Design an enzyme around this catalytic site. Structure first.
Site, PDB file in Angstrom:
ATOM      1  N   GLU A  35       0.923  -1.235  -0.063  1.00 26.96           N
ATOM      2  CA  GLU A  35       0.052  -0.014  -0.034  1.00 26.96           C
ATOM      3  C   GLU A  35       0.920   1.388  -0.021  1.00 26.96           C
ATOM      4  O   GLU A  35       0.733   2.068  -0.800  1.00 26.96           O
ATOM      5  CB  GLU A  35      -0.930  -0.034   1.103  1.00 26.96           C
ATOM      6  CG  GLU A  35      -1.954  -0.955   1.253  1.00 26.96           C
ATOM      7  CD  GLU A  35      -2.912  -0.617   0.273  1.00 26.96           C
ATOM      8  OE1 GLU A  35      -3.128   0.489  -0.397  1.00 26.96           O
ATOM      9  OE2 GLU A  35      -3.968  -1.532  -0.185  1.00 26.96           O
ATOM     10  N   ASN A  46      -7.912   9.263  -5.297  1.00 21.60           N
ATOM     11  CA  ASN A  46      -8.654   8.325  -6.042  1.00 21.60           C
ATOM     12  C   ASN A  46      -9.574   8.967  -7.167  1.00 21.60           C
ATOM     13  O   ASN A  46      -9.942  10.401  -7.152  1.00 21.60           O
ATOM     14  CB  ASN A  46      -9.519   7.434  -5.222  1.00 21.60           C
ATOM     15  CG  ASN A  46      -8.691   6.836  -3.925  1.00 21.60           C
ATOM     16  OD1 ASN A  46      -8.964   6.714  -2.976  1.00 21.60           O
ATOM     17  ND2 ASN A  46      -7.793   6.048  -4.434  1.00 21.60           N
ATOM     18  N   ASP A  48     -12.788   9.112  -7.475  1.00 24.04           N
ATOM     19  CA  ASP A  48     -14.062   9.370  -6.901  1.00 24.04           C
ATOM     20  C   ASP A  48     -13.753  10.677  -6.244  1.00 24.04           C
ATOM     21  O   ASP A  48     -14.727  11.575  -5.385  1.00 24.04           O
ATOM     22  CB  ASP A  48     -14.931   8.389  -6.192  1.00 24.04           C
ATOM     23  CG  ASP A  48     -13.872   7.979  -4.861  1.00 24.04           C
ATOM     24  OD1 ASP A  48     -12.940   8.457  -4.607  1.00 24.04           O
ATOM     25  OD2 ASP A  48     -14.622   7.171  -4.063  1.00 24.04           O
ATOM     26  N   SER A  50     -11.885  11.066  -3.417  1.00 17.42           N
ATOM     27  CA  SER A  50     -11.507  10.869  -2.165  1.00 17.42           C
ATOM     28  C   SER A  50      -9.831  10.536  -2.197  1.00 17.42           C
ATOM     29  O   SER A  50      -9.198  10.499  -3.391  1.00 17.42           O
ATOM     30  CB  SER A  50     -11.822   9.457  -1.549  1.00 17.42           C
ATOM     31  OG  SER A  50     -11.710   8.291  -2.323  1.00 17.42           O
ATOM     32  N   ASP A  52      -6.355   8.529  -0.204  1.00 18.49           N
ATOM     33  CA  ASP A  52      -5.912   7.366   0.864  1.00 18.49           C
ATOM     34  C   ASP A  52      -4.703   8.021   1.575  1.00 18.49           C
ATOM     35  O   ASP A  52      -3.826   8.656   0.892  1.00 18.49           O
ATOM     36  CB  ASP A  52      -5.500   6.274  -0.048  1.00 18.49           C
ATOM     37  CG  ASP A  52      -6.627   5.336  -0.559  1.00 18.49           C
ATOM     38  OD1 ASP A  52      -7.818   5.403  -0.168  1.00 18.49           O
ATOM     39  OD2 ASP A  52      -6.391   4.511  -1.704  1.00 18.49           O
ATOM     40  N   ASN A  59      -8.832   5.225   3.469  1.00 17.71           N
ATOM     41  CA  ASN A  59      -9.650   6.417   2.576  1.00 17.71           C
ATOM     42  C   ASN A  59     -10.533   7.193   3.094  1.00 17.71           C
ATOM     43  O   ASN A  59     -11.228   6.953   4.263  1.00 17.71           O
ATOM     44  CB  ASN A  59     -10.561   5.418   1.562  1.00 17.71           C
ATOM     45  CG  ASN A  59     -10.983   6.034   0.722  1.00 17.71           C
ATOM     46  OD1 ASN A  59     -12.358   6.409   0.870  1.00 17.71           O
ATOM     47  ND2 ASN A  59     -10.757   6.340  -0.401  1.00 17.71           N
TER      48      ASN A  59
HETATM   49 NA    NA Z   1      -6.832   2.319  -1.763  1.00 18.37          NA
HETATM   50 NA    NA Z   2      -3.140   1.695  -2.595  1.00 15.98          NA
END
Ligand code: NA
Ligand code: NA
Ligand SMILES: [Cl-]
Ligand code: NA
Ligand code: NA
Length: 129
Positions: A35, A46, A48, A50, A52, A59
């Site tokens: 990650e 992201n 949308d 949002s 992370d 998120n």
């Molecule tokens: Na993610």
């Molecule tokens: Na990720």
């Protein structure tokens, strides 16, 4: 902070993640590696709108408040900036809520696609825990 592999494993054990909801420590280290590359300051935006945040890429649509994800929730009751700290307490506490939500660690796409079904114990091999 960019953690070392064994350094992060020890920190996650001290924070109670080993075998939390049945997930051995190597699962959590593997998820953090893919990650965030072990970097507490990682952020990614992201599609949308949002974002992370942090070592486990939590998120803003559901879990933290960043002030710029309209109509989102803040189920961990924290500012998203708290997830970027060198101290992993906030990320661990919020991750415990996520993994208890019903889908286990499948909430983390990198875990499902790169850790699930592999020898995750390899991620803690050699570490003094
Ligand atoms: Na993610
Ligand atoms: Na990720
Ligand atoms: Cl589960
Ligand atoms: Na939010
Ligand atoms: Na949910």
């Amino acid at each position: 902070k960019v953690f070392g592999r064994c350094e992060l494993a020890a920190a996650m054990k001290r924070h109670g993640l080993d075998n939390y909801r049945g997930y051995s420590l190597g699962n959590w280290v593997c998820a953090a590696k893919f990650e965030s590359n072990f970097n507490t300051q990682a952020t990614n935006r992201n599609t949308d709108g949002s974002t992370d945040y942090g070592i486990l890429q939590i998120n803003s649509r559901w879990w933290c408040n960043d002030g710029r994800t309209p109509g989102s929730r803040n189920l961990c009751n924290i500012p998203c900036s708290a997830l970027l700290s060198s101290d992993i307490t906030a990320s661990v506490n919020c991750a415990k809520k996520i993994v208890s939500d019903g889908n286990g660690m499948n909430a983390w796409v990198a875990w499902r696609n790169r850790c699930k079904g592999t020898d995750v114990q390899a991620w803690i091999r050699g570490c003094r825990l």
